[PDB]
Amino acid sequence: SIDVKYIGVKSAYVSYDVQKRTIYLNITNTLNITNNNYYSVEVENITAQVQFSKTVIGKARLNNITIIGPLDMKQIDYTVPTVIAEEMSYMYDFCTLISIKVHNIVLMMQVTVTTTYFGHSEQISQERYQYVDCG
Amino acid sequence: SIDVKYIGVKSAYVSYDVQKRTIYLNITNTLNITNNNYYSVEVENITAQVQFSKTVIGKARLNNITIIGPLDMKQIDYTVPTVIAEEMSYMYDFCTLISIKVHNIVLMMQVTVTTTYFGHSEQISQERYQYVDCG
Amino acid sequence: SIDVKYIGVKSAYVSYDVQKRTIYLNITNTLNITNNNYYSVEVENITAQVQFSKTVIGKARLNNITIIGPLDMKQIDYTVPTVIAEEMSYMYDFCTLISIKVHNIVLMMQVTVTTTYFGHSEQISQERYQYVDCG
Numbered sequence: 001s002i003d004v005k006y007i008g009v010k011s012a013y014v015s016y017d018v019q020k021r022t023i024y025l026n027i028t029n030t031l032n033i034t035n036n037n038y039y040s041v042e043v044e045n046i047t048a049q050v051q052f053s054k055t056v057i058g059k060a061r062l063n064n065i066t067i068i069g070p071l072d073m074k075q076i077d078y079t080v081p082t083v084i085a086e087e088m089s090y091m092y093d094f095c096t097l098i099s100i101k102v103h104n105i106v107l108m109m110q111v112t113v114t115t116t117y118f119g120h121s122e123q124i125s126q127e128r129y130q131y132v133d134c135g
Numbered sequence: 136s137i138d139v140k141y142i143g144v145k146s147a148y149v150s151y152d153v154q155k156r157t158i159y160l161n162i163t164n165t166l167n168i169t170n171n172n173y174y175s176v177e178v179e180n181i182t183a184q185v186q187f188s189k190t191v192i193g194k195a196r197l198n199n200i201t202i203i204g205p206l207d208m209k210q211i212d213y214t215v216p217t218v219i220a221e222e223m224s225y226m227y228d229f230c231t232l233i234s235i236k237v238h239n240i241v242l243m244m245q246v247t248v249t250t251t252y253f254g255h256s257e258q259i260s261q262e263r264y265q266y267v268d269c270g
Numbered sequence: 271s272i273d274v275k276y277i278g279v280k281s282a283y284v285s286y287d288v289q290k291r292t293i294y295l296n297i298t299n300t301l302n303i304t305n306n307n308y309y310s311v312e313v314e315n316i317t318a319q320v321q322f323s324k325t326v327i328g329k330a331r332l333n334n335i336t337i338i339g340p341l342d343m344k345q346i347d348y349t350v351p352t353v354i355a356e357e358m359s360y361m362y363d364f365c366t367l368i369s370i371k372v373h374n375i376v377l378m379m380q381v382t383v384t385t386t387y388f389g390h391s392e393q394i395s396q397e398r399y400q401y402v403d404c405g
């Protein structure tokens with residue numbers, strides 16, 4: 001993961017952020033640039049060789065080699081009564097982003113209950129922009 | 136994952152963000168650029184060789200080699216009564232993004248209960264923009 | 271996943287964002303650019319060799335080699351009574367994006383209960399734009 005970037009307003013290799021009142025003139029700004037990037041990553045050469053009970057040559061009664069489980073998860077239990085029992089909102093809004101009593105859930109799961117798993121996984125997750133940009 | 140980017144308003148390799156009042160003139164701005172990018176990633180050369188109980192040559196009674204389970208997940212249980220028992224909203228809004236009592240859920244799952252899985256998975260997830268841009 | 275991008279308003283390789291009052295003139299802006307990109311990714315050369323119980327040569331009574339399960343998921347259980355028992359909304363709106371009591375669900379699943387799975391999966395998920403752009 002080479003560039004996990006979080007630039008705030010903006011990114012740029014070569015920028016001229018000139019943004020208030022600036023009489024500027026007769027500039028030469030010669031720019032030779034050689035920005036080579038090389039990426040030679042994640043060269044897996046693996047030989048797992050994953051094996052159960054290779055050679056029971058004779059008479060070996062085997063039993064219960066791999067008991068995974070039993071198991072529960074029960075991950076998300078809000079259990080939120082919220083018995084206000086007198087609501088008088090009287091809610092005057094102006095140009096406000098306003099989230100009320102919302103349940104934003106992003107449950108991303110992968111590679112669950114898999115005996116074996118080679119190679120690789122990847123879970124990216126962007127989040128909301130939500131730009132009012134009011135007057 | 137080379138560029139997991141989150142640029143805020145904007146990205147640009149070579150930008151001129153000139154955005155207030157700026158008399159500018161007679162500039163040469165020569166730009167030689169060689170931006171080569173090379174990506175040579177994820178070269179898997181794997182030999183899993185995944186095997187159960189290769190050679191029971193003789194008389195081996197085998198039993199219960201791999202008991203996965205039993206199991207439950209029960210992931211999302213809101214259980215949200217919300218018995219207000221007197222609602223007088225009286226809700227005057229102006230140019231407000233307003234989420235009320237919404238349940239945003241994005242349940243992304245993959246590769247579940249798979250004995251074996253080679254290669255790779257990938258779960259991207261963008262989120263909402265929601266740009267009011269009011270007056 | 272090389273560019274998982276989230277540019278906020280806009281992206282551009284070579285931009286001139288000139289957006290307020292700017293008398294600008296006699297500029298040469300020569301731009302030699304060589305933006306070669308090479309992508310040589312995900313070259314899988316795998317030999318899984320996935321095998322159960324290769325050679326029971328003699329007399330081996332086998333049994334219950336792979337018991338996956340039993341199992342439940344029961345993922346999404348809102349269970350949201352919401353017995354307000356006096357609603358007087360009186361809801362005057364102006365040019366507001368307004369979500370009320372909506373249940374946005376995006377359940378993306380794939381590769382479930384598959385004994386084996388080679389190659390690769392991919393789950394992208396965009397989200398809503400929802401641009402009011404009111405007066």
Ligand SMILES: *[C@@H]1O[C@H](CO)[C@@H](O)[C@H](O)[C@H]1NC(C)=O
Binds near residue numbers: 025026161
């Ligand atoms: C910019 O260049 C011209 C030409 O060489 C020169 O006459 C002028 O004086 C320069 N600008 C200023 C503000 O002096």
Ligand SMILES: *[C@@H]1O[C@H](CO)[C@@H](O)[C@H](O)[C@H]1NC(C)=O
Binds near residue numbers: 167
């Ligand atoms: C520009 O940079 C490249 C790379 O280093 C070089 O080969 C070339 O001679 C340079 N040219 C000038 C005019 O500086």
Ligand SMILES: *[C@@H]1O[C@H](CO)[C@@H](O)[C@H](O)[C@H]1NC(C)=O
Binds near residue numbers: 045180
């Ligand atoms: C991968 O490993 C094998 C086993 O030793 C070897 O013969 C081969 O040269 C290796 N290749 C690379 C690119 O590492």
Ligand SMILES: *[C@@H]1O[C@H](CO)[C@@H](O)[C@H](O)[C@H]1NC(C)=O
Binds near residue numbers: 063064067199
């Ligand atoms: C193997 O595991 C199961 C799981 O509970 C159990 O019921 C059984 O008795 C075990 N076998 C032996 C021989 O103990």
Ligand SMILES: *[C@@H]1O[C@H](CO)[C@@H](O)[C@H](O)[C@H]1NC(C)=O
Binds near residue numbers: 025
């Ligand atoms: C821009 O260039 C012209 C021509 O060389 C020059 O006469 C002028 O003075 C320059 N600009 C300014 C503000 O001086």
Ligand SMILES: *[C@@H]1O[C@H](CO)[C@@H](O)[C@H](O)[C@H]1NC(C)=O
Binds near residue numbers: 167
């Ligand atoms: C521009 O850059 C390239 C790459 O380094 C180089 O071969 C070339 O000579 C350069 N030209 C000038 C005029 O600088």
Ligand SMILES: *[C@@H]1O[C@H](CO)[C@@H](O)[C@H](O)[C@H]1NC(C)=O
Binds near residue numbers: 045180315
């Ligand atoms: C992959 O591995 C095999 C086994 O050793 C080897 O012969 C081959 O050269 C390797 N290739 C690469 C590109 O690593």
Ligand SMILES: *[C@@H]1O[C@H](CO)[C@@H](O)[C@H](O)[C@H]1NC(C)=O
Binds near residue numbers: 063198199202334
């Ligand atoms: C194998 O596992 C099952 C799962 O509960 C169990 O009922 C059974 O008794 C096990 N076998 C032995 C021989 O214990």
Ligand SMILES: *[C@@H]1O[C@H](CO)[C@@H](O)[C@H](O)[C@H]1NC(C)=O
Binds near residue numbers: 295
């Ligand atoms: C732009 O170029 C002309 C021609 O060279 C020059 O006369 C003029 O003065 C320049 N602009 C300004 C504002 O000086």
Ligand SMILES: *[C@@H]1O[C@H](CO)[C@@H](O)[C@H](O)[C@H]1NC(C)=O
Binds near residue numbers: 167169302304
């Ligand atoms: C432009 O760039 C290319 C690539 O580096 C180079 O071959 C060429 O000579 C350059 N030309 C000029 C006029 O700079």
Ligand SMILES: *[C@@H]1O[C@H](CO)[C@@H](O)[C@H](O)[C@H]1NC(C)=O
Binds near residue numbers: 180315
């Ligand atoms: C793939 O692996 C085989 C087995 O060793 C090997 O002969 C072959 O050269 C490899 N090819 C590449 C492109 O890695």
Ligand SMILES: *[C@@H]1O[C@H](CO)[C@@H](O)[C@H](O)[C@H]1NC(C)=O
Binds near residue numbers: 334
């Ligand atoms: C094999 O598993 C099943 C699943 O419950 C079980 O009923 C059975 O008794 C098992 N066999 C043995 C020999 O234990």
